[PDB]
Amino acid sequence: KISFFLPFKCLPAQHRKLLFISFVCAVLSGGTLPFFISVFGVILKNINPIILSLVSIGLVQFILSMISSYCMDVITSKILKTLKLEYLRSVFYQDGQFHDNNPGSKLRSDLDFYLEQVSSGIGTKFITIFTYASSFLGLYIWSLIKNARLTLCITCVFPLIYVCGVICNKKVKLNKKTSLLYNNNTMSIIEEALMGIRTVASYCGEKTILNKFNLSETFYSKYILKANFVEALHIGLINGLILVSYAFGFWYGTRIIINSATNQGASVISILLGVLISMFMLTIILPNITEYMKALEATNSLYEIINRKPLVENNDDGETLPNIKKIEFKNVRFHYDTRKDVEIYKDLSFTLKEGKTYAFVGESGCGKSTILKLIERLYDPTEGDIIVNDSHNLKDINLKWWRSKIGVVSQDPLLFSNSIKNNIKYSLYSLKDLEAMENYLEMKKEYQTIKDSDVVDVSKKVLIHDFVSSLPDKYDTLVGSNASKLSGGQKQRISIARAIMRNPKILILDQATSSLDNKSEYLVQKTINNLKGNENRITIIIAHRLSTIRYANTIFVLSNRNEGSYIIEQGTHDSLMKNKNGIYHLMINNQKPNNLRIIYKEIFSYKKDVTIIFFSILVAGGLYPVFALLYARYVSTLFDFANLEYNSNKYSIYILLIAIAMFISETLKNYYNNKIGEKVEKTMKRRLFENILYQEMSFFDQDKNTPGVLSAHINRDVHLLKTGLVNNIVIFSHFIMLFLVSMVMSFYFCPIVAAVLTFIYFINMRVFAVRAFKDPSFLIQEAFYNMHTVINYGLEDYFCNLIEKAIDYKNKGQKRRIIVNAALWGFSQSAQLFINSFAYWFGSFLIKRGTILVDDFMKSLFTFIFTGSYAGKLMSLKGDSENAKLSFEKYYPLMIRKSNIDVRDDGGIRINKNLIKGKVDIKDVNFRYISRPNVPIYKNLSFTCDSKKTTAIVGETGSGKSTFMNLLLRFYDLNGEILLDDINICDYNLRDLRNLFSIVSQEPMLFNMSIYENIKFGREDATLEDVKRVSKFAAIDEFIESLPNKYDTNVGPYGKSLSGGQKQRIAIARALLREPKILLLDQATSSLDSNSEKLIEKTIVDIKDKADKTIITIAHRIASIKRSDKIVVFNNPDRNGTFVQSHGTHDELLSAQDGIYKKYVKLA
Ligand SMILES: Nc1ncnc2c1ncn2[C@@H]1O[C@H](COP(=O)(O)OP(=O)(O)OP(=O)(O)O)[C@@H](O)[C@H]1O
Ligand SMILES: Nc1ncnc2c1ncn2[C@@H]1O[C@H](COP(=O)(O)OP(=O)(O)OP(=O)(O)O)[C@@H](O)[C@H]1O
């Protein structure tokens, strides 16, 4: 065993008393039915006071049962809050090795899988057990005092039912665990598809994903259906065993009758009829024990994750030094966990003092960013040490205080999606929390102390104050998901400002000036190298353009030329190039309302599946009241002896025949339920995702249709249907069949009372049917995608407290919807006696009149007890049925919506890839975004690229360079024209338009498949030989052939298990395999050293030496621009638009008229 009361362990003393009250106020309400029997039996056989007593005990039953339902639904939605908060707080404090093996899409699935079990095992189903177990003892203890030997045969049977459960549970968890893995698999395909929709749409790979989705769901439905078969057999078998035992009891009971009535109604019949009700209660109890025993394992598995202990603990056991000096590596080694057989470092060691600048240079696979991550203690070394100030090791200093001084600008900027000033002010929270919380909550209030004076000047210091002051909502406008609204240089400037604001002692810049022109870079560098406090700090620059590090106290050069990188040179700018003919000299010489009808229509189509369940419900529903015959026709044939033994042997065999029919009906009722529900779930899951995957780009720029929201809709609110909407109907049908059989059985005795009270039961049945700060999922996904920023700037408790205010905001009807359900639950348990009292009332008159007898009245009233007692099951699945309908109503329009720009339209000019000139002409252009329609960008653009020529485009940051590309691929429609071979782009049947282009985007992206499949994206029919051929021009087919599982190696999610230079060359290779007619490049050499850069340049100029390809490029390095044919300059003198100024300079007209190009040539 594990335990019993785990979910109720971590509670305060304010809810434990509520638990005690809810426990005690149910046993009382349960022990009134046998008390009612004991009173009614003695009072019937002998007017106002008795009716008043009956109504009074009914009322106190109502009042006692109303409280237990209110004081139980309050604990449920506090446990379900506490667990979910404790889960995702010991995920932020976990080390980095935990995040490599456990992707973010694997955690959400487990979370919202186990919480469903916990919710469906501690709700209203917890109290029905205890309130129907009291009625068991009330009738079992009564029947025991009279004759115990007749009754104590089932206690010998209790051990046998305990054995089926063990095996029938052991044969379940295997399949459930095997299905959870494929669930985790198919959840990692949705997020990666929605984040990279711009690439999927461009390469037409939105059909390859559907096949993976369908395979992963097909291997899932099989195992889940195989698992939920055993559970339909277990409960179907227990009923049969119980009825067989009852048959043995009846057989033993007839023995004393045949003895006495021969050798010398009846009380024995009464005893057996009292025993029957106990078994009828066990029929209701047992199918809720399992669902409670499923929750213990789930919450155990959750506490297993919550009580994890990582290697790098963020305790408060560290130290606090005065100041920072002399970081020092000493014989460091390191390797990663996935690739245990791939070493990186040989003998890494150096020293760094304060008040100086430093630099790192090398190839694109060495260890630079790995050092960046190794300083901040995301990871730990294996053999060396990072001793600080020659008397203290880094594994003994307080991590919070150490991170309270470092400013970071990473190789991939990661901003949140609220606003600019809040993103810039987030740097200070981790310092104010140190000021307040370590003095004497004083934290949540001092965040207002941060005034709007430092934001202004720190924005002035990065040349963004002018642009941010021109648009509406200066410091209040919001940025989209991953800051998709802004541009690259803008995000770099925002991150630099966020780093400067806190005045760090240590600063680490990792390719921060990659997407910025020469002039702004020079000005920003002049600003940073004279900032206040520069007399004592340590700045660490990493760069590929060696012009920015001309001044530096030391320059470290390192290489790996095949078992580990190492340093080869040390010296300044002047004392390094003139010394020898090393690598550095070569480098510097190189540079120089009625919607639910859609569901039922799908249910009433599997015609042979709805038939069997119907004929099984018809048999399992009414076979308890049919026993009423078996006694009557038996008791009618007691005083006709000399043939009694024949009947006695006959009716026991009839009971056996009924027992063997209970089994089949129950198990076929319980299995085909889930079989029908899963098949609705699959279709409703597929259609939504399929429709969403073909929509346009503006649909994804909206505020609410974010990637973290849609996945939750799909998974959760398509899974809810199977349970709620398809099980509740089955329950209603079972109840209806009980009622329809009981009303037939009651006419057999006396039709008057039946015709009277069926009306009342119909009315009481009608009551049950007709009675009726953003989201949490946004924040959780937004945190899981940007874990590095959140760990660097110390933002765990902030999001923790911020998600609580959304859980509470979503729960507002959580208070009103409970009292209604509690009143209904009380009315279910108290609607039985109010009717019996009225029956006695209007029966006394007719009995006194002399028209109806007492016996038939009694045994016509007694037979409705089953349908009176079964009403408690009409309240176990109400909330999940309502939530499902609400969710369906608020995701149906996504399912039905259609797109304006759809690739499936197959009508238009079909274009062949044999006769194409490749001329792109522009007549006039005017464009404006919908997110902020006051900012004009383009005004009368005019330029051309003729055919098989090379064209270069230079401009200022924010001018619209990476917007022409998007307009050219039908991401956004137009006022103006763009012509390909003198015909507009809107009339080409864009399946072929997107076939002959090939882009190299500004931020590459990869998926969790292998390299072989990522390079084959789009073009499925291709051999490994073509891949080997095309991976040679990319200058990457040496690293891959030094690696286990060369082309079968699995990259991580989004490409995090590779570097930036590799991720980019792989994208280049992917673009070259398609054999494109038009090649679009956008900063294709931003993260590459000069050697790889000139190799790819050799490939490009070789391709340019021959015809049959039209190339367009964008770059800031002046070196790779002179070899073009025409150079186009964009400008924006007054902030109203852009127009062409220069045209066709080609490095021969650099200063003829006043322009900007004459600066960009000389500044670098
Ligand atoms: N999570 C990971 N698991 C396993 N290996 C990794 C992981 N992240 C990076 N690597 C490997 O570590 C090596 C070093 O990568 P590094 O961070 O030094 O790239 P880089 O030098 O910054 O590249 P660039 O110079 O182009 O920016 C790479 O060869 C890469 O394959
Ligand atoms: N999704 C969007 N919604 C609204 N406006 C946008 C969106 N994307 C870009 N913009 C606007 O377009 C302008 C320029 O965008 P773009 O990214 O094309 O410039 P860029 O030339 O790529 O900049 P860089 O040269 O730094 O990459 C920005 O000022 C921005 O306000």
Ligand SMILES: [Mg+2]
């Ligand atoms: Mg890097």
Ligand SMILES: [Mg+2]
């Ligand atoms: Mg750009």
